[PDB]
């Protein structure tokens, strides 16, 4: 479990790895620009950091950057930047290709989406979403791209839509039961999970999951601690959520979801509390 970037009074350069077996934290090479509100993913075994923002005492620069971490070089390397800066981006990987979804640049909330090819180092625009979405959760299932929740600049969203690559088109699907911006969104086997987030009034601990075969969202066991802007990933068939903000403190808590008994429990404590991280596994 690798977490990159994040926010704790300023955007951070931390790259750290958590081990669910031995429970100890590995501290690794720093990002070559601090970022929060970024997304992380893995392609070809290399970890990509996508978008985000450097919120510092001397600036607040939205990031168009794409950069590559190699787990046995302990080295970061820059890749081609995106069309636009995307703070609070979501990403998903189809066929080893990078889809960058939504996010913001200043007051502009993107509905734009663009595709990166790792072995060509190229971005190009695809069809935009039906909705402008920042803090969108993104997941991939059955070679389809799902954009879930988010914020359009005015309303926070329970809607979700689906991208079909070979038709270049977005399809609205059944909305979530809960409005969520900055939730953790991932696949645990074959339910698209949406955990936590912010509905414009409170940070959430509720978790719900989408069943494609019935096009139904159903609620499962909620987290122990409400959290928004959390990282999320699935390891060994279990879901891990990392940090976030609960309206009062930047959480270092990390929770595990065991799907077969449907319970959450405290697994570990991050080295420092933070929100807005990028998380991925390799």
């Amino acid at each position: 479990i690798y977490t990159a970037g994040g926010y704790f009074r300023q955007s951070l350069s931390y790259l750290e790895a958590y081990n669910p077996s031995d429970g100890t934290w590995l501290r690794l090479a720093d990002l070559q620009v601090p970022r929060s509100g970024l997304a992380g993913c893995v392609v070809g075994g290399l970890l990509y950091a996508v978008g985000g923002r450097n919120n510092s005492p001397d600036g607040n620069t939205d990031s168009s950057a794409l950069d590559c971490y190699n787990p046995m070089t302990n080295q970061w390397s820059p890749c081609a930047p995106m069309s636009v800066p995307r703070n609070r981006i979501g990403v998903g990987v189809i066929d080893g290709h990078i889809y960058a979804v939504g996010g913001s640049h200043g007051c502009i909330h993107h509905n734009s989406v663009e595709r990166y090819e790792p072995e060509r180092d190229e971005w190009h625009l695809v069809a935009p979403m039906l909705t402008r979405r920042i803090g969108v959760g993104v997941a991939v299932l059955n070679r389809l791209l799902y954009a879930v929740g988010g914020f359009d600049g005015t309303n926070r969203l329970n809607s979700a839509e689906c991208y079909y690559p070979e038709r270049n088109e977005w399809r609205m699907i059944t909305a979530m039961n809960t409005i969520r911006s900055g939730a953790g969104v991932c696949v645990l086997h074959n339910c698209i999970y949406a955990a936590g987030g912010y509905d414009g009034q409170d940070q959430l601990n509720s978790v719900e999951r989408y069943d494609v075969a019935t096009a139904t969202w159903t609620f499962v066991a909620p987290m122990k601690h409400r959290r928004s802007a959390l990282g999320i990933t699935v390891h060994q068939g279990r879901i891990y959520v990392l940090g976030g903000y609960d309206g009062h403190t930047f959480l270092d808590s990390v929770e595990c979801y065991d799907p077969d008994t449907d319970t959450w429990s405290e697994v570990t404590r991050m080295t420092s509390g933070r929100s807005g991280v990028g998380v991925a596994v390799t």
Partner: peptide, 7 residues
């Protein structure tokens, strides 16, 4: 600086 992310 906002309730969703803490920033």
């Amino acid at each position: 600086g906002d309730e969703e992310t803490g920033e």
